[PDB]
Amino acid sequence: AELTKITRGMQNGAETINDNLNKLNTITVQKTGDETIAGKKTFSGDVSVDGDFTMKKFADSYVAFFANKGSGNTVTFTAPWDCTAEVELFYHGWGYSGGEWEIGITTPSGLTQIYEATGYTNGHDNQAISMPTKAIYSGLKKGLQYTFDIRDANGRGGGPKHPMMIVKLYRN
Amino acid sequence: MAELTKITRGMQNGAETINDNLNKLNTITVQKTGDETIAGKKTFSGDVSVDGDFTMKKFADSYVAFFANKGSGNTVTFTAPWDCTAEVELFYHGWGYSGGEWEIGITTPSGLTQIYEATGYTNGHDNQAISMPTKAIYSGLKKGLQYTFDIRDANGRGGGPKHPMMIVKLYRN
Amino acid sequence: AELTKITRGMQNGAETINDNLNKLNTITVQKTGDETIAGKKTFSGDVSVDGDFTMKKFADSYVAFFANKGSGNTVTFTAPWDCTAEVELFYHGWGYSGGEWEIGITTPSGLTQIYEATGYTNGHDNQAISMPTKAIYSGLKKGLQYTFDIRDANGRGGGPKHPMMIVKLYRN
Amino acid sequence: KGTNAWVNKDLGEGFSIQPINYKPGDKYTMSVDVMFTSWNVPAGTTISAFWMRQRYTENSWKEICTIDLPKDPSKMLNQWIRITQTSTIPPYEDPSVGTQAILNVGFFGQQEGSFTIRVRNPKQELGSIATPYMPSASEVTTADWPKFVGTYVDTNPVSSTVSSKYDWDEMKYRVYLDGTPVGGSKLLSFDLENLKAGTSYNVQVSQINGNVESDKSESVAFKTTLPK
Numbered sequence: 001a002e003l004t005k006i007t008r009g010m011q012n013g014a015e016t017i018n019d020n021l022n023k024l025n026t027i028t029v030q031k032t033g034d035e036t037i038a039g040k041k042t043f044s045g046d047v048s049v050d051g052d053f054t055m056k057k058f059a060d061s062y063v064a065f066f067a068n069k070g071s072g073n074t075v076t077f078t079a080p081w082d083c084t085a086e087v088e089l090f091y092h093g094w095g096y097s098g099g100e101w102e103i104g105i106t107t108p109s110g111l112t113q114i115y116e117a118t119g120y121t122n123g124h125d126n127q128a129i130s131m132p133t134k135a136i137y138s139g140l141k142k143g144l145q146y147t148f149d150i151r152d153a154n155g156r157g158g159g160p161k162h163p164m165m166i167v168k169l170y171r172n
Numbered sequence: 173m174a175e176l177t178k179i180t181r182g183m184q185n186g187a188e189t190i191n192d193n194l195n196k197l198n199t200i201t202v203q204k205t206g207d208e209t210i211a212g213k214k215t216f217s218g219d220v221s222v223d224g225d226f227t228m229k230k231f232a233d234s235y236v237a238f239f240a241n242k243g244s245g246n247t248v249t250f251t252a253p254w255d256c257t258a259e260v261e262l263f264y265h266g267w268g269y270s271g272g273e274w275e276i277g278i279t280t281p282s283g284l285t286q287i288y289e290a291t292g293y294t295n296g297h298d299n300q301a302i303s304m305p306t307k308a309i310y311s312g313l314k315k316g317l318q319y320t321f322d323i324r325d326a327n328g329r330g331g332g333p334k335h336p337m338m339i340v341k342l343y344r345n
Numbered sequence: 346a347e348l349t350k351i352t353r354g355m356q357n358g359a360e361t362i363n364d365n366l367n368k369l370n371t372i373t374v375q376k377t378g379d380e381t382i383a384g385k386k387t388f389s390g391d392v393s394v395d396g397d398f399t400m401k402k403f404a405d406s407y408v409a410f411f412a413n414k415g416s417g418n419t420v421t422f423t424a425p426w427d428c429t430a431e432v433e434l435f436y437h438g439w440g441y442s443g444g445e446w447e448i449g450i451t452t453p454s455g456l457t458q459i460y461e462a463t464g465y466t467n468g469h470d471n472q473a474i475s476m477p478t479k480a481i482y483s484g485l486k487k488g489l490q491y492t493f494d495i496r497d498a499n500g501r502g503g504g505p506k507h508p509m510m511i512v513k514l515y516r517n
Numbered sequence: 518k519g520t521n522a523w524v525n526k527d528l529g530e531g532f533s534i535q536p537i538n539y540k541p542g543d544k545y546t547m548s549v550d551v552m553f554t555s556w557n558v559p560a561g562t563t564i565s566a567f568w569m570r571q572r573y574t575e576n577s578w579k580e581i582c583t584i585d586l587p588k589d590p591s592k593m594l595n596q597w598i599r600i601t602q603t604s605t606i607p608p609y610e611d612p613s614v615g616t617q618a619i620l621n622v623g624f625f626g627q628q629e630g631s632f633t634i635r636v637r638n639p640k641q642e643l644g645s646i647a648t649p650y651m652p653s654a655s656e657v658t659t660a661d662w663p664k665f666v667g668t669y670v671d672t673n674p675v676s677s678t679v680s681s682k683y684d685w686d687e688m689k690y691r692v693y694l695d696g697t698p699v700g701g702s703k704l705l706s707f708d709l710e711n712l713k714a715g716t717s718y719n720v721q722v723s724q725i726n727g728n729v730e731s732d733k734s735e736s737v738a739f740k741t742t743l744p745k
Binding site: 013014015017018021022024025028029030031032033034035036037038039040041042043044045046047048049050051052053054057058059060063065067069072088090092124127128129130132161162164166 | 173174176178179180181183186190193194197200201202208209210211212213214215216217218219220221222223224225226227228229234235256257275287288289290291292293294295296297302303304305307309343344345
């Protein structure tokens with residue numbers, strides 16, 4: 001705010017003081033009443049909203065989805081910001097000459113796999129049955145390119161059909 | 173907002189009224205330092221960033237929405253609560269016509285863009301229903317507009333469904 | 346903010362008024378321009394952000410992942426903050442002596458199961474096939490401990506293999 | 518420049534003090550030199566609300582202090598026109614009613630209208646007389662004030678408008694009544710005129726010595742008598 005200087009000997013002292021008090025009163029954010037605040041407001045410390053909090057484009061600036069269109073086996077992406085990843089591989093298959101096959105997701109260097117749910121299949125030779133696999137990854141960093149693949153836990157692979165890996169990114 | 177008493181030339185307690193106006197402004201204003209409590213509906217025109225610990229009440233009520241069909245589980249019909257991004261999962265179980273191939277997905281309503289799709293494939297085991305879940309992500313959902321996500325078929329013939337359930341997550345935009 | 350008192354007959358009245366006006370102008374948060382605000386700011390009423398809302402560590406502060414490592418059938422956890430749960434049980438199995446088996450997730454006392462997608466299996470005796478189950482739970486409270494198990498809807502259980510229950514927690 | 522439009526330029530930053538400080542009923546006089554270097558206003562196009570005005574805004578729109586500008590200076594182009602107007606401060610509005618200061622013109626009709634105007638020495642002063650151009654109190658220097666005083670006596674109550682009728686001396690003193698200068702003299706005496714009855718006044722004098730002004734003297738207080 002641009003206030004007019006109050007000096008000894010000035011003319012229009014009362015009005016300039018009045019205008020300055022009025023300027024300050026109308027430009028300042030106050031501890032009461034409904035208001036509208038313009039400008040980029042950066043808060044250093046903690047902020048708490050007891051009432052109803054409302055924001056624009058939440059899903060765009062916090063949730064990011066990256067999946068491989070042409071293969072669905074390996075997803076390669078440049079992280080938009082710091083985040084937590086939720087990798088799901090929608091696989092369908094059979095174990096080599098029937099029987100056991102367990103699939104998961106590889107943990108890239110610099111990432112920590114919090115939890116893992118492996119996808120198991122048995123019997124039904126040369127027929128592909130649902131076997132989805134899921135894992136949660138923490139410490140994904142801005143600009144750093146990451147690659148999540150299909151890892152094998154136990155058993156042999158017979159052959160995949162219609163695979164699709166989806167990556168959810170909960171911004172940190 | 174604050175109620176200041178006018179400063180005029182010739183007024184009686186000029187010094188004392190200036191002091192009271194300065195004191196009023198000093199105690200009612202939000203300042204760039206210290207812990208404070210701010211009353212009233214505060215609408216910010218520009219960008220807002222919180223470096224410290226941001227606390228908001230009821231985040232899941234405010235930003236997430238779950239809609240699913242109870243009585244059928246194949247067709248979810250809902251009126252969007254706010255501008256969102258949809259994450260549709262259809263928990264299907266079935267078999268292909270007289271055994272063999274059957275691939276299922278989810279239909280893209282007009283005005284929506286299907287970002288990614290993971291189809292649900294099944295083979296053999298005639299007149300026995302095996303897990304075959306399907307998932308797809310949809311963008312450009314608008315406040316108060318009614319949408320309908322169904323079961324689409326990609327490749328093969330449908331034999332018969334059993335225990336289907338479609339769940340829709342809505343991440344507010 | 347410490348303002349210097351304006352009194353009747355004071356020697357540097359003009360100079361002190363200017364000073365106090367200048368102090369107020371530089372220390373106050375205003376309805377215009379880009380600024381940086383320090384201190385814990387508690388808002389009693391509603392708050393709306395029309396512009397871009399930047400959040401430090403959103404992921405950790407609004408999302409929580411709890412899963413059982415050693416068993417994968419029963420997840421037991423203390424709710425960090427009042428929330429909404431999204432329980433997925435990545436099960437694989439077969440019905441007793443072949444045939445039907447339908448699995449779900451138990452609703453703890455004080456919780457409301459919004460929606461439920463049960464996991465069905467048929468035939469393929471002593472061979473475990475994918476049968477994932479999902480359910481959404483509302484009214485989770487800060488500090489109280491919860492336990493989500495495997496419930497049976499219809500049919501007999503033959504035997505499980507590679508189970509893993511994951512619990513997403515959206516703060517509310 | 519405009520077509521079926523009001524065109525304005527904000528003058529708000531050129532007014533020392535906000536118009537809600539002026540007491541209702543007081544007079545203020547506006548004076549300005551104006552020149553039109555180009556006037557392209559066609560047949561169908563009409564000029565309206567052409568002025569420099571301080572006024573109330575939403576709901577009211579009532580003028581506080583204004584000056585009309587020439588509605589058709591096409592036959593007087595490239596000439597300095599001096600325009601003066603005394604305005605009476607209107608009564609205060611609701612506190613919710615705001616103010617503004619603008620240079621406005623309205624071009625209405627089929628074709629676009631435009632002009633180019635030069636504005637020299639704009640002035641607003643308290644009073645009913647457009648006195649010689651002076652800068653503001655915050656910008657005024659010793660040099661800006663009259664240097665010579667002229668006097669003559671015994672004639673009719675009204676004063677001559679011919680410089681030669683007066684006896685011209687270089688002023689050696691400046692007389693300040695209530696902080697503002699009201700004249701001066703070569704002599705060690707000055708007559709304070711046009712005062713109001715039963716009111717207190719303060720006077721202080723300074724010495725002039727060719728654009729070198731002394732600090733002001735110690736003030737002296739007096740009160741005009743009350744009439745019967």
